[PDB]
């Protein structure tokens, strides 16, 4: 269903359209979608959800996208490598920037809270 639309939106290469249908799908369906998704468009898709992670405040959503992605298409990425090693390398960067920004601040705060909560 949504899948169909997303494969067409990639089939057209129209970036804005890809984005509309991308944010369109509900978070509960992402599994289903990524599972049935064409492998040839998987590297391209990665480049996308990478660039979305680092240019639009939708953390849980994008991280979920990468999550279900590596989950359903991991062995593939492994064996293939090649050009995908660039795609991979921007995903890593993408989660890294996401990591050290949302972790560094969070736990620090809560640790201080903890000490204060203990006197």
């Amino acid at each position: 269903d949504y899948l169909k639309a997303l494969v067409m939106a990639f089939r057209l290469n129209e970036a804005g359209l890809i984005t509309r249908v991308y944010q369109a799908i509900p978070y509960t369906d992402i599994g289903l979608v990524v599972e049935q998704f064409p492998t040839v468009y998987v590297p391209r898709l990665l480049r996308f959800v990478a660039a979305q992670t680092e240019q639009s405040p939708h953390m849980e959503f994008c991280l979920l996208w990468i999550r279900a992605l590596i989950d359903k298409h991991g062995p593939w990425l492994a064996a293939n490598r090649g050009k995908v090693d660039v795609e991979l390398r921007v995903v890593a960067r993408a989660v890294a920037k996401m990591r050290d920004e949302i972790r560094r601040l969070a736990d620090e705060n809560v640790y201080m809270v903890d000490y204060l909560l203990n006197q």
Binding site: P57, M59, E60, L63, L64, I66, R67, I70, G74, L77, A78, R81, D85, L88, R89, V91, A92, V95, A96, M98, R99, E101, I102, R103, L105, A106, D107, E108, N109, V110, M112, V113, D114, L116, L117, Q119
Partner: protein
């Protein structure tokens, strides 16, 4: 951009709307107020269950239970506890308030850190 000014704050009728939030349930107006001014060092550094700190902490707690603005929540919370940590260790109400904040803060931290953790890790593995 906004995430450049956010990293700028941590290097360095307002109280009206924030206190009106106590009457209301949505400190939303106040959140926008804060989202405005760049020298929050001047503003943040500023009786009986109607002193500003309890309600500010309550406002960050409110934002946490949303699904947005984790970034500025933490950013504001660290500069809050950068200078107010000696003054709030003296009072009791804002202690129970931080005790409530820590709840939501914890749940969500767990969620997000498992996600960026799982992803960061598995991807670091796959590129090997």
């Amino acid at each position: 951009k906004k995430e450049k000014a956010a990293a700028n704050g941590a290097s360095r009728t307002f109280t009206s709307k924030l206190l009106v939030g106590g009457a209301k349930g949505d400190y939303t107006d106040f959140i926008e107020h804060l989202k405005a001014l760049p020298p929050a060092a001047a503003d943040l550094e500023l009786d009986e269950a109607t002193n500003e700190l309890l309600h500010f902490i309550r406002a960050l707690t409110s934002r946490l239970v949303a699904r947005r603005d984790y970034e500025l929540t933490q950013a504001w919370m660290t500069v809050f506890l950068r200078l107010h940590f000696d003054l709030i260790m003296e009072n009791e109400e804002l202690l129970q308030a931080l005790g409530e904040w820590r709840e939501h803060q914890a749940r969500e931290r767990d969620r997000l850190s498992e996600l960026v953790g799982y992803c960061g890790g598995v991807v670091s593995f796959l590129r090997s």
